[PDB]
């Protein structure tokens, strides 16, 4: 939770704002998580 | 040995000899050759006694089994096919018995004959099968209309087995009439049938 709030804080900074909005948090949940375990792969071929 | 079947408007009526004779030998004077297959299905067998019973039991077992698996009442058309399939597959154990399956179902009324050599044919609203059949077809057809009630049908049914019995020296005086009226499944049994033919005197 500390990492979400710091990371959300990174979006707010970029966009030049003091306040953290709703969009920034959900963006931080997506950001942090994505870089830790992956999403691509795969569709058939043979699994279709 | 002979068996009859006719389609009533409000029912279906079929009949069996309840005493079967061959030579001077009588096996039983309470021998079943009339089979209750399900609640409003019946089977009447002409041909051999023993093979009748043995085949006939398995067909009961099927009626239940199918009804449970389908969540519905079985059809006549299912079981009509089935007997014949069983009979063709076990021609190493052949059952040399001539069946008549008929009755009432969701599909409606119809009477199928199954040959002792397999195969399921449909008869329009009359059927006879056996030794006494040749005469019997005409006996029924005299008073057969499609709007004949159940009561007149049973009268009518007796007269065909009655026809056979005098010609041959080796038929029974026992008789069972089966009524299938979709409200009862009544088995008239020798006594009740007897007095129908005591109008016919003998």
């Amino acid at each position: 939770i500390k990492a979400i709030c710091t990371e959300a804080g990174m979006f707010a900074i970029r966009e030049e704002r003091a306040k953290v909005t709703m969009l920034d948090f959900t963006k931080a949940i997506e950001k942090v998580l994505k870089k830790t375990t992956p999403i691509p792969d795969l569709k058939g071929v043979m699994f279709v | 040995t002979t068996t009859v079947g006719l389609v009533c408007k409000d029912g279906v009526v079929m009949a069996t000899e309840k005493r079967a004779t061959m030579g001077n030998f009588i096996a039983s004077k309470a021998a079943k050759k009339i089979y209750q297959i399900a609640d409003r299905m019946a089977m009447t067998t002409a041909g051999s006694v023993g093979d009748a019973q043995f085949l006939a039991r398995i067909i009961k077992i099927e009626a239940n089994l199918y009804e449970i698996r389908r969540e519905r009442k079985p059809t006549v058309r299912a079981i009509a096919t089935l007997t014949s399939n069983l009979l063709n597959s076990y021609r190493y154990f052949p059952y040399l018995v001539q069946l008549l399956i008929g009755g009432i179902d969701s599909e409606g009324k119809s009477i199928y004959s199954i040959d002792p050599i397999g195969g399921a044919i449909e008869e329009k609203d009359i059927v006879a099968t056996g030794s006494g059949s040749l005469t019997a077809y005409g006996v029924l057809e005299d008073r057969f209309t499609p709007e004949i009630g159940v009561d007149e049908a049973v009268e009518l049914a007796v007269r065909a087995i009655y026809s056979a019995m005098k010609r041959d020296s080796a038929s029974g005086d026992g008789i069972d009439v089966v009524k299938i009226t979709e409200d009862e499944f009544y088995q008239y049994s020798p006594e009740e049938v007897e007095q129908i033919l005591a109008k016919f005197r003998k």
Binding site: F47 | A78, N85
Partner: protein, 242 residues
């Protein structure tokens, strides 16, 4: 690691055959297909988007005739579909032989469910990792979903595969049990658009149906499917703006 997904015979501590929820995931990754049950009939819509245009644009098939009154559509391995459908089509034809009766959607469902449960129970042979949709009209419209483990679940409307999740929420709101044939069809086509995140084209959908009054299976032809699509694209676009 686990050793409970080594084989089917091994349950996890969780009281789960871990290897059959993994056969389940096999369905999800493949392309989507939707059955939509109304009282005026049943509708079956299934993928043809697959590949590019180096493939036939009339690549075959997701919409298998099983009988002339029963159809099925699939997700999962279409290897496992090819054999499973061969067995299904034969299983149905056996019923017609030995009873001279069309088999009922539900009774068919039990027999293929029993077939899948044979490989599920045995350890020396892997289960199927394919789901089956069986939609027909036997004498009322009926729709089942057959699970990879041989389980039977009856649906009001269902989809399976990739787009399942999008459909679940969409139909949760709009679908009614009292829909028209026209309505239900157009709507499942709206739903099929959302599933693949694009407009339809009749070359990217194969569509079949079994009607109540016809009692027959018929596959809707690409340009006879085109006016339906044409009224469906409006809605799909409306919902992809947002």
């Amino acid at each position: 690691q686990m050793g409970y997904d080594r084989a089917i015979t091994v349950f996890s501590p969780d009281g789960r055959l871990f290897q059959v929820e993994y056969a389940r995931e096999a369905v999800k990754r493949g392309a989507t297909a939707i059955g939509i049950k109304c009282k005026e009939g049943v509708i079956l819509i299934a993928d043809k988007r697959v590949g590019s245009k180096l493939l036939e644009a009339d690549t075959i098939e997701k919409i298998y005739k099983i009988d002339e009154h029963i159809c099925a559509a699939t997700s999962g391995l279409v290897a496992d579909a090819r054999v499973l459908i061969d067995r299904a089509r034969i299983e149905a034809q056996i019923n017609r032989l030995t009873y001279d009766e069309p088999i009922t959607v539900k009774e068919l469902a039990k027999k293929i469910c029993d077939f899948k449960q044979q490989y599920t129970q045995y350890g020396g042979v892997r289960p199927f990792g394919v789901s089956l949709l069986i939609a027909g009209v036997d004498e009322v419209p009926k729709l089942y979903e057959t699970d990879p483990s041989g389980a039977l679940l009856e649906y009001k409307a269902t989809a399976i595969g990739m787009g399942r999740n999008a459909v679940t929420e969409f139909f949760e709101k709009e679908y009614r049990d009292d829909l028209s044939f026209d309505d239900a069809m157009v709507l499942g086509l709206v739903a099929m658009g959302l599933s693949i995140e694009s407009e339809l084209v009749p070359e990217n959908i194969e569509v079949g149906y079994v009607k109540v009054d016809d009692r027959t299976f018929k596959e809707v032809s690409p340009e006879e499917l085109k006016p339906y699509v044409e009224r469906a694209n409006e809605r799909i676009r409306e919902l992809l703006k947002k």
